[PDB]
């Protein structure tokens, strides 16, 4: 028989996990080969050659159906299981509502600190900054920048985000890990700016964050269960999208 089958497949906000068997007990397998494909295109791609039997497939359009099949080598490939097609869940980003000092677009995506006080920092409505999702932030518009000022991402939401167990980055560009600044900076953001937050696996995380066309990737250490993100400016005028 074809050697091996997909036996689950895991679908999360920020990926796939694929995972195999090897339904012949007599072949012995040396290495597993996993593809890929949207189900709209019409070509596999190659996404794991190795010796496990599970693969976090990452970075996958969220709403979207892919097509995934396997083989083994243990010399020629096998035959490839039966494709089986998965997707990533859908969890959209959304801003807490309520907040005082920050008035929200219809689809709760956009904030915008207003004229009223502001208790602190204005946070996602939940943690829904999930393993392997790509967070993106636009600046729409600006105000007068303060250097409490942030935008990143933290372990829990807490009564700025320049503190423990957060990431982020400030309006000009000075970008802060659990509380203490980092030498390389960012350039500071305008309209139009987009910020991006991608993470890779106590827990040390490795951060990449871009912004106007640079990037600067550091080493996080805090206490991948889902995160918060949130947002805090000081004066008012500031607008920012996440996606
Ligand atoms: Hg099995
Ligand atoms: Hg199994
Ligand atoms: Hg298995
Ligand atoms: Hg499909
Ligand atoms: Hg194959
Ligand atoms: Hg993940
Ligand atoms: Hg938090
Ligand atoms: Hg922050
Ligand atoms: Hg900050
Ligand atoms: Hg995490
Ligand atoms: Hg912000």
Same mark, same amino acid.
């Given at each position: 028989r074809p050697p091996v089958q997909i036996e689950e497949l895991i679908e999360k906000p920020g990926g796939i996990i694929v995972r195999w068997c090897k339904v012949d007990d007599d072949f012995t397998a040396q290495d597993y080969r996993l593809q890929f494909r949207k189900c709209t295109a019409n070509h596999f791609e190659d996404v794991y050659v190795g010796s496990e039997t599970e693969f976090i497939v990452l970075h996958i359009d969220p709403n979207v159906d892919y097509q995934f099949r396997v083989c083994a080598r243990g010399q020629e490939w096998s035959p490839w299981s039966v494709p089986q097609t998965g997707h990533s869940t859908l969890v959209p980003h959304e801003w807490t509502t309520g907040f005082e000092g920050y008035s929200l677009s219809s689809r709760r995506n956009?904030?915008?600190?207003?004229?009223?006080? %502001? =208790?602190?920092?204005? @946070? %996602? =409505?939940?943690?829904? @900054?999930?393993?392997?999702?790509?967070?993106?932030?636009?600046?729409?518009?600006?105000?007068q920048p303060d250097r409490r000022d942030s935008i990143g991402v933290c372990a829990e939401r807490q009564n700025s985000l320049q503190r423990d167990q957060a990431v982020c980055i400030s309006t000009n560009g000075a970008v802060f890990v659990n509380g203490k600044e980092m030498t390389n900076q960012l350039?500071?953001?305008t309209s139009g700016s987009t910020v991006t937050f991608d993470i890779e696996a106590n827990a040390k995380l490795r951060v990449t964050i871009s912004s106007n066309n640079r990037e600067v990737v550091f080493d996080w250490l805090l206490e991948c269960g889902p995160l918060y993100f949130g947002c805090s400016f000081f004066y008012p005028g500031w607008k920012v999208l996440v996606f």
């Amino acid at each position: 028989r074809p050697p091996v089958q997909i036996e689950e497949l895991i679908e999360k906000p920020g990926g796939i996990i694929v995972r195999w068997c090897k339904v012949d007990d007599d072949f012995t397998a040396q290495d597993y080969r996993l593809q890929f494909r949207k189900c709209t295109a019409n070509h596999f791609e190659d996404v794991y050659v190795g010796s496990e039997t599970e693969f976090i497939v990452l970075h996958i359009d969220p709403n979207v159906d892919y097509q995934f099949r396997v083989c083994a080598r243990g010399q020629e490939w096998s035959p490839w299981s039966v494709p089986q097609t998965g997707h990533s869940t859908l969890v959209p980003h959304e801003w807490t509502t309520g907040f005082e000092g920050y008035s929200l677009s219809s689809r709760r995506n956009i904030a915008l600190r207003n004229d009223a006080e %502001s =208790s602190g920092v204005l @946070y %996602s =409505s939940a943690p829904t @900054y999930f393993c392997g999702q790509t967070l993106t932030f636009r600046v729409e518009t600006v105000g007068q920048p303060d250097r409490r000022d942030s935008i990143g991402v933290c372990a829990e939401r807490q009564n700025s985000l320049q503190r423990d167990q957060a990431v982020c980055i400030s309006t000009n560009g000075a970008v802060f890990v659990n509380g203490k600044e980092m030498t390389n900076q960012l350039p500071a953001v305008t309209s139009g700016s987009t910020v991006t937050f991608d993470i890779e696996a106590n827990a040390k995380l490795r951060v990449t964050i871009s912004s106007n066309n640079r990037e600067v990737v550091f080493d996080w250490l805090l206490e991948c269960g889902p995160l918060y993100f949130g947002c805090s400016f000081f004066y008012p005028g500031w607008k920012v999208l996440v996606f």
